[PDB]
Structure 1
Amino acid sequence: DELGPVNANPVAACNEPLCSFDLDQLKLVAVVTGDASPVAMVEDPAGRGHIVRRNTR
């Protein structure tokens, strides 16, 4: 009666992820810079890549 309504709501979003992990666990992978303003790229202790820029958290 709940499975026969065959229903899944897939994961693809942010988990709201890095605000659940401590800052000294995160490692700077790379930096990008161009007309779209400078942006940093950083790695989780879970091995995900993220992209963050001036004014973000």
Structure 2
Amino acid sequence: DELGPVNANPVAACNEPLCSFDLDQLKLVAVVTGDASPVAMVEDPAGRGHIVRRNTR
């Protein structure tokens, strides 16, 4: 009666990664700089890459 019509499973959840891991675990991969302001690139102990810049956390 509800599957024959239209189905969405909305996002509201957790997903917020580096604020769940300690700072000395993170490793600086690279840095980018240009007109869009300077941005750092950093690696998780889980091996993900992230991009963060001045004023971010």
Which of the five TM-score ranges fits, normalised by the shorter chain? 0.7 to 0.9
CA change 1:52–1:6 in 2 (3 A) is same
**Percent of paired sites with the same residue:** 100
CA distances 1:21-49 after superposition (whole Å, capped 9, x unpaired): 00000000000000000000000000000
CA distance in structure 1 between the aligned counterparts of 2:23 and 2:51, rounded to whole angstroms: 14
CA distance in structure 1 between the aligned counterparts of 2:39 and 2:49, rounded to whole angstroms: 13
CA distance in structure 1 between the aligned counterparts of 2:51 and 2:12, rounded to whole angstroms: 16
Q: Secondary structure at the match of 2:6?
A: coil
The CA RMSD measured in Å over matched residues stands at 3.4
TM-score normalized by structure 1?
0.76
Structure 2, unpaired ranges of 5+ = none
Q: CA deviation at 1:7?
A: 7.2
Q: Deviation above 2 Å: which 4+ runs of structure 1?
A: 1-15
Q: CA deviation at 1:8?
A: 8.4
CA distance in structure 2 between the aligned counterparts of 1:12 and 1:43, rounded to whole angstroms: 26
Q: CA deviation at 1:55?
A: 0.1
